[PDB]
Amino acid sequence: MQILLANPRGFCAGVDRAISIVENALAIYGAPIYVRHEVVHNRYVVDSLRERGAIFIEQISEVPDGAILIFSAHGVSQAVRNEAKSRDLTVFDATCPLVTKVHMEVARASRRGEESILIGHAGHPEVEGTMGQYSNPEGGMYLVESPDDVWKLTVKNEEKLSFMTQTTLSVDDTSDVIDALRKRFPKIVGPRKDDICYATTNRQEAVRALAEQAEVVLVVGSKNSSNSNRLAELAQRMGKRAFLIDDAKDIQEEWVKEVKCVGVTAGASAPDILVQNVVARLQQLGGGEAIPLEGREENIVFEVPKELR
Numbered sequence: 001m002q003i004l005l006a007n008p009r010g011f012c013a014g015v016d017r018a019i020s021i022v023e024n025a026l027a028i029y030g031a032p033i034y035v036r037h038e039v040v041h042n043r044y045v046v047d048s049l050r051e052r053g054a055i056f057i058e059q060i061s062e063v064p065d066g067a068i069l070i071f072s073a074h075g076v077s078q079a080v081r082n083e084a085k086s087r088d089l090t091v092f093d094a095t096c097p098l099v100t101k102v103h104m105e106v107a108r109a110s111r112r113g114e115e116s117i118l119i120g121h122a123g124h125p126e127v128e129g130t131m132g133q134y135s136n137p138e139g140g141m142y143l144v145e146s147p148d149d150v151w152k153l154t155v156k157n158e159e160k161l162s163f164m165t166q167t168t169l170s171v172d173d174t175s176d177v178i179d180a181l182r183k184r185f186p187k188i189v190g191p192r193k194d195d196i197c198y199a200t201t202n203r204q205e206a207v208r209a210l211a212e213q214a215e216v217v218l219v220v221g222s223k224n225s226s227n228s229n230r231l232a233e234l235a236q237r238m239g240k241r242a243f244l245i246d247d248a249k250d251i252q253e254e255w256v257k258e259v260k261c262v263g264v265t266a267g268a269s270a271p272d273i274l275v276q277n278v279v280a281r282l283q284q285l286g287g288g289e290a291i292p293l294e295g296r297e298e299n300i301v302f303e304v305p306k307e308l309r
Protein backbone atom coordinates (compact mmCIF):
# COMPACT_ATOMS: atom_id res chain seq x y z
CA MET A 1 0.00 0.00 0.00
CA GLN A 2 0.90 3.59 -0.79
CA ILE A 3 1.36 6.19 1.95
CA LEU A 4 0.67 9.80 0.92
CA LEU A 5 1.48 12.91 2.93
CA ALA A 6 -0.47 16.13 2.66
CA ASN A 7 1.32 19.41 2.11
CA PRO A 8 1.13 21.58 3.85
CA ARG A 9 0.50 19.88 7.20
CA GLY A 10 1.68 20.29 10.79
CA PHE A 11 3.09 23.33 12.56
CA CYS A 12 1.99 26.81 11.60
CA ALA A 13 3.80 30.01 12.43
CA GLY A 14 1.70 30.82 15.51
CA VAL A 15 2.16 27.36 17.05
CA ASP A 16 5.87 27.30 16.44
CA ARG A 17 6.16 30.73 18.04
CA ALA A 18 3.99 29.82 21.09
CA ILE A 19 6.01 26.68 21.84
CA SER A 20 9.28 28.48 21.48
CA ILE A 21 8.02 31.10 23.94
CA VAL A 22 7.35 28.52 26.65
CA GLU A 23 10.62 26.69 25.93
CA ASN A 24 12.74 29.83 26.07
CA ALA A 25 11.02 31.06 29.23
CA LEU A 26 11.81 27.70 30.87
CA ALA A 27 15.40 28.02 29.78
CA ILE A 28 15.77 31.57 30.95
CA TYR A 29 13.87 31.50 34.25
CA GLY A 30 13.75 27.75 35.05
CA ALA A 31 10.77 25.84 36.40
CA PRO A 32 8.07 26.56 37.07
CA ILE A 33 6.59 28.56 34.23
CA TYR A 34 2.82 29.07 34.39
CA VAL A 35 0.78 28.93 31.19
CA ARG A 36 -2.89 29.94 30.87
CA HIS A 37 -4.45 27.03 29.00
CA GLU A 38 -2.65 24.36 26.98
CA VAL A 39 -0.16 26.38 24.96
CA VAL A 40 -1.36 24.62 21.79
CA HIS A 41 -3.93 21.80 21.72
CA ASN A 42 -1.47 18.96 21.42
CA ARG A 43 -1.09 16.30 24.10
CA TYR A 44 2.48 15.37 23.12
CA VAL A 45 3.61 19.02 23.27
CA VAL A 46 1.77 19.77 26.50
CA ASP A 47 2.90 16.55 28.28
CA SER A 48 6.50 17.37 27.30
CA LEU A 49 6.33 20.93 28.59
CA ARG A 50 4.66 19.77 31.80
CA GLU A 51 7.54 17.36 32.50
CA ARG A 52 9.98 20.22 31.75
CA GLY A 53 8.34 22.48 34.43
CA ALA A 54 5.42 24.21 32.71
CA ILE A 55 2.20 24.19 34.72
CA PHE A 56 -1.03 24.67 32.76
CA ILE A 57 -3.90 26.53 34.42
CA GLU A 58 -7.24 28.06 33.31
CA GLN A 59 -7.76 30.86 35.80
CA ILE A 60 -5.28 33.46 37.03
CA SER A 61 -6.21 32.81 40.70
CA GLU A 62 -4.38 29.45 40.59
CA VAL A 63 -1.12 31.30 39.79
CA PRO A 64 0.97 32.47 42.80
CA ASP A 65 2.49 35.91 43.36
CA GLY A 66 5.84 36.61 41.65
CA ALA A 67 5.28 33.97 38.94
CA ILE A 68 5.99 34.01 35.21
CA LEU A 69 2.78 33.54 33.22
CA ILE A 70 2.30 32.93 29.49
CA PHE A 71 -1.04 33.28 27.66
CA SER A 72 -1.69 30.40 25.23
CA ALA A 73 -1.66 30.75 21.47
CA HIS A 74 -5.46 30.88 21.33
CA GLY A 75 -5.63 34.21 23.17
CA VAL A 76 -7.37 35.54 26.26
CA SER A 77 -10.15 37.88 27.15
CA GLN A 78 -9.55 41.46 28.29
CA ALA A 79 -10.80 40.39 31.73
CA VAL A 80 -8.09 37.69 31.98
CA ARG A 81 -5.42 40.09 30.70
CA ASN A 82 -6.46 42.72 33.25
CA GLU A 83 -6.53 40.26 36.16
CA ALA A 84 -3.04 39.18 35.18
CA LYS A 85 -1.97 42.86 35.06
CA SER A 86 -3.53 43.65 38.46
CA ARG A 87 -1.68 40.69 40.02
CA ASP A 88 2.05 40.87 40.86
CA LEU A 89 2.97 38.82 37.74
CA THR A 90 5.45 38.90 34.84
CA VAL A 91 3.45 38.21 31.69
CA PHE A 92 4.38 36.92 28.25
CA ASP A 93 1.76 36.71 25.53
CA ALA A 94 2.01 33.79 23.10
CA THR A 95 -1.28 34.72 21.42
CA CYS A 96 -0.83 34.22 17.68
CA PRO A 97 -0.60 37.55 15.84
CA LEU A 98 -3.44 36.44 13.51
CA VAL A 99 -5.71 36.03 16.54
CA THR A 100 -4.63 39.44 17.92
CA LYS A 101 -5.64 41.04 14.62
CA VAL A 102 -9.23 39.83 15.18
CA HIS A 103 -9.19 40.99 18.81
CA MET A 104 -8.28 44.53 17.77
CA GLU A 105 -11.38 44.74 15.57
CA VAL A 106 -13.70 43.52 18.32
CA ALA A 107 -12.22 46.02 20.77
CA ARG A 108 -12.81 48.82 18.23
CA ALA A 109 -16.49 47.96 17.76
CA SER A 110 -16.84 47.77 21.58
CA ARG A 111 -15.50 51.27 22.01
CA ARG A 112 -18.09 52.50 19.54
CA GLY A 113 -20.98 50.74 21.18
CA GLU A 114 -21.58 49.02 17.85
CA GLU A 115 -22.57 45.41 17.62
CA SER A 116 -20.41 42.60 16.36
CA ILE A 117 -21.06 38.96 15.46
CA LEU A 118 -18.48 36.21 15.85
CA ILE A 119 -18.67 33.02 13.80
CA GLY A 120 -17.12 30.24 15.86
CA HIS A 121 -17.56 27.25 18.17
CA ALA A 122 -19.02 27.91 21.66
CA GLY A 123 -16.72 27.04 24.55
CA HIS A 124 -13.51 27.14 22.56
CA PRO A 125 -10.74 29.22 24.17
CA GLU A 126 -10.23 31.39 21.06
CA VAL A 127 -13.95 32.21 21.02
CA GLU A 128 -13.92 32.99 24.73
CA GLY A 129 -10.94 35.30 24.18
CA THR A 130 -12.35 37.05 21.11
CA MET A 131 -15.86 37.48 22.59
CA GLY A 132 -13.99 38.71 25.67
CA GLN A 133 -12.63 41.72 23.77
CA TYR A 134 -16.18 43.23 23.83
CA SER A 135 -17.38 45.05 26.94
CA ASN A 136 -20.03 47.60 25.97
CA PRO A 137 -23.52 46.82 27.37
CA GLU A 138 -24.94 49.42 24.98
CA GLY A 139 -23.69 47.52 21.94
CA GLY A 140 -23.54 43.74 21.70
CA MET A 141 -21.41 40.69 20.90
CA TYR A 142 -23.18 37.64 19.51
CA LEU A 143 -21.92 34.15 18.70
CA VAL A 144 -23.23 32.25 15.70
CA GLU A 145 -22.17 28.69 14.83
CA SER A 146 -24.45 28.01 11.82
CA PRO A 147 -26.90 29.55 9.37
CA ASP A 148 -29.72 28.54 11.71
CA ASP A 149 -28.14 30.67 14.47
CA VAL A 150 -28.09 33.58 12.04
CA TRP A 151 -31.77 33.00 11.10
CA LYS A 152 -32.65 33.38 14.81
CA LEU A 153 -30.43 36.29 15.81
CA THR A 154 -31.89 39.74 16.43
CA VAL A 155 -29.75 42.79 17.03
CA LYS A 156 -30.33 46.32 18.25
CA ASN A 157 -29.12 48.20 15.22
CA GLU A 158 -28.54 46.27 11.99
CA GLU A 159 -27.27 49.48 10.38
CA LYS A 160 -24.10 49.46 12.46
CA LEU A 161 -23.07 45.80 12.47
CA SER A 162 -19.87 43.85 11.78
CA PHE A 163 -18.63 40.30 11.79
CA MET A 164 -15.44 38.47 12.68
CA THR A 165 -14.49 34.76 12.66
CA GLN A 166 -12.56 32.15 14.51
CA THR A 167 -9.23 31.45 12.77
CA THR A 168 -9.60 27.65 12.51
CA LEU A 169 -13.04 27.16 10.99
CA SER A 170 -14.18 25.00 8.09
CA VAL A 171 -13.76 27.22 4.99
CA ASP A 172 -16.88 25.71 3.37
CA ASP A 173 -19.19 26.03 6.39
CA THR A 174 -18.04 29.55 7.17
CA SER A 175 -18.91 30.62 3.64
CA ASP A 176 -22.47 29.43 4.28
CA VAL A 177 -22.69 31.39 7.55
CA ILE A 178 -21.45 34.59 5.93
CA ASP A 179 -23.90 34.15 3.06
CA ALA A 180 -26.66 33.92 5.66
CA LEU A 181 -25.41 36.99 7.55
CA ARG A 182 -25.42 39.13 4.44
CA LYS A 183 -28.95 38.00 3.49
CA ARG A 184 -30.36 38.79 6.96
CA PHE A 185 -28.24 41.94 7.54
CA PRO A 186 -27.52 43.51 4.21
CA LYS A 187 -25.52 46.41 5.78
CA ILE A 188 -23.19 44.14 7.79
CA VAL A 189 -19.48 44.82 7.35
CA GLY A 190 -16.45 42.64 7.64
CA PRO A 191 -13.15 41.64 6.05
CA ARG A 192 -12.99 40.82 2.34
CA LYS A 193 -13.63 37.15 3.20
CA ASP A 194 -13.16 36.07 6.82
CA ASP A 195 -10.54 35.74 9.59
CA ILE A 196 -9.65 32.12 8.77
CA CYS A 197 -5.85 32.06 8.77
CA TYR A 198 -3.57 30.97 5.90
CA ALA A 199 -2.63 27.76 7.80
CA THR A 200 -6.27 26.66 8.21
CA THR A 201 -7.13 27.43 4.61
CA ASN A 202 -3.96 25.74 3.36
CA ARG A 203 -4.31 22.55 5.44
CA GLN A 204 -7.96 22.15 4.45
CA GLU A 205 -6.97 22.62 0.79
CA ALA A 206 -4.18 20.07 1.26
CA VAL A 207 -6.47 17.44 2.88
CA ARG A 208 -8.99 17.94 0.07
CA ALA A 209 -6.26 16.93 -2.42
CA LEU A 210 -5.15 14.08 -0.20
CA ALA A 211 -8.68 12.72 0.17
CA GLU A 212 -9.20 12.77 -3.59
CA GLN A 213 -6.39 10.21 -3.90
CA ALA A 214 -6.48 8.25 -0.62
CA GLU A 215 -9.11 5.78 0.60
CA VAL A 216 -8.39 6.34 4.31
CA VAL A 217 -7.11 9.55 5.94
CA LEU A 218 -5.24 9.74 9.28
CA VAL A 219 -5.15 13.17 10.89
CA VAL A 220 -2.51 13.61 13.55
CA GLY A 221 -3.92 15.94 16.17
CA SER A 222 -5.48 15.96 19.63
CA LYS A 223 -9.23 15.67 20.30
CA ASN A 224 -9.46 19.24 21.47
CA SER A 225 -7.70 20.74 18.38
CA SER A 226 -10.42 22.51 16.43
CA ASN A 227 -8.35 22.92 13.27
CA SER A 228 -7.36 19.23 13.40
CA ASN A 229 -11.01 18.25 13.77
CA ARG A 230 -11.89 20.28 10.64
CA LEU A 231 -9.35 18.26 8.60
CA ALA A 232 -10.83 14.90 9.64
CA GLU A 233 -14.33 16.24 9.07
CA LEU A 234 -13.48 17.46 5.56
CA ALA A 235 -12.22 14.02 4.54
CA GLN A 236 -15.26 12.27 6.02
CA ARG A 237 -17.61 14.52 4.14
CA MET A 238 -15.77 13.49 0.98
CA GLY A 239 -16.75 9.90 1.83
CA LYS A 240 -13.40 8.72 3.19
CA ARG A 241 -12.86 6.92 6.45
CA ALA A 242 -10.90 9.48 8.49
CA PHE A 243 -9.45 9.21 11.97
CA LEU A 244 -8.16 11.81 14.35
CA ILE A 245 -5.24 10.32 16.24
CA ASP A 246 -2.65 11.49 18.77
CA ASP A 247 0.02 9.03 17.77
CA ALA A 248 0.80 5.79 16.01
CA LYS A 249 -0.43 3.70 18.94
CA ASP A 250 -3.97 4.87 18.12
CA ILE A 251 -3.88 3.15 14.69
CA GLN A 252 -6.22 0.15 14.59
CA GLU A 253 -5.17 -2.44 11.96
CA GLU A 254 -8.75 -2.87 10.65
CA TRP A 255 -8.69 0.75 9.48
CA VAL A 256 -6.03 0.08 6.89
CA LYS A 257 -6.33 -3.72 6.44
CA GLU A 258 -7.07 -3.97 2.75
CA VAL A 259 -6.46 -0.38 1.80
CA LYS A 260 -4.49 0.37 -1.34
CA CYS A 261 -3.76 4.00 -0.47
CA VAL A 262 -3.63 5.78 2.90
CA GLY A 263 -3.21 9.51 3.41
CA VAL A 264 -1.61 11.23 6.40
CA THR A 265 -1.82 14.83 7.50
CA ALA A 266 -1.42 16.80 10.71
CA GLY A 267 -3.17 19.73 12.28
CA ALA A 268 -1.45 22.99 13.03
CA SER A 269 -0.36 21.98 16.56
CA ALA A 270 1.06 18.47 15.81
CA PRO A 271 4.85 18.06 15.68
CA ASP A 272 6.46 16.29 12.75
CA ILE A 273 7.83 13.46 14.89
CA LEU A 274 4.25 12.25 15.48
CA VAL A 275 3.77 12.04 11.70
CA GLN A 276 7.09 10.14 11.27
CA ASN A 277 6.00 7.58 13.88
CA VAL A 278 2.60 7.26 12.18
CA VAL A 279 4.33 6.57 8.87
CA ALA A 280 6.67 4.09 10.61
CA ARG A 281 3.59 2.20 11.88
CA LEU A 282 1.86 2.17 8.50
CA GLN A 283 5.07 0.68 7.02
CA GLN A 284 4.83 -2.10 9.59
CA LEU A 285 1.32 -2.63 8.19
CA GLY A 286 2.52 -2.97 4.56
CA GLY A 287 3.09 0.62 3.46
CA GLY A 288 6.03 1.76 1.34
CA GLU A 289 8.03 4.98 1.23
CA ALA A 290 5.90 7.97 2.12
CA ILE A 291 5.10 10.10 -0.92
CA PRO A 292 4.64 13.79 -0.20
CA LEU A 293 2.02 15.52 -2.30
CA GLU A 294 2.97 18.73 -4.07
CA GLY A 295 1.52 21.70 -2.28
CA ARG A 296 1.40 25.43 -1.64
CA GLU A 297 4.66 26.66 -0.09
CA GLU A 298 4.18 28.52 3.20
CA ASN A 299 6.74 31.18 4.06
CA ILE A 300 5.50 33.02 7.11
CA VAL A 301 7.37 33.03 10.39
CA PHE A 302 6.55 34.87 13.63
CA GLU A 303 9.57 35.59 15.86
CA VAL A 304 9.65 35.26 19.64
CA PRO A 305 9.76 38.52 21.58
CA LYS A 306 13.25 39.90 21.98
CA GLU A 307 13.14 39.48 25.70
CA LEU A 308 12.84 35.70 25.18
CA ARG A 309 15.57 35.67 22.48
Ligand SMILES: C/C(=C\COP(=O)(O)OP(=O)(O)O)CN
Pocket residue numbers: 014015039040041042073074096099126167168224225226227228267268269
Ligand atom coordinates in the same frame (compact mmCIF):
# COMPACT_ATOMS: atom_id res chain seq x y z
C1 LIG B 1 -3.64 28.65 18.60
C2 LIG B 1 -4.66 28.21 17.55
C3 LIG B 1 -4.43 27.02 16.65
C4 LIG B 1 -3.33 26.07 16.70
O1 LIG B 1 -3.92 24.78 16.81
P1 LIG B 1 -4.54 24.26 18.22
O2 LIG B 1 -3.63 24.52 19.26
O3 LIG B 1 -4.80 22.93 17.97
O4 LIG B 1 -5.84 25.10 18.51
P2 LIG B 1 -7.30 25.15 17.87
O5 LIG B 1 -8.09 24.20 18.75
O6 LIG B 1 -7.19 24.74 16.59
O7 LIG B 1 -7.62 26.49 18.02
C5 LIG B 1 -5.92 28.99 17.26
N1 LIG B 1 -5.43 30.18 16.51
Ligand code: SF4
Pocket residue numbers: 012013014015073096097098099167168197198199200227268
Ligand atom coordinates in the same frame (compact mmCIF):
# COMPACT_ATOMS: atom_id res chain seq x y z
S1 SF4 C 1 -3.82 28.28 13.36
FE1 SF4 C 1 -3.52 30.19 12.33
S2 SF4 C 1 -4.17 31.72 13.74
FE2 SF4 C 1 -3.88 29.88 14.91
S3 SF4 C 1 -1.85 29.85 15.64
FE3 SF4 C 1 -1.67 28.85 13.71
S4 SF4 C 1 -1.30 30.54 12.30
FE4 SF4 C 1 -2.02 31.48 14.12
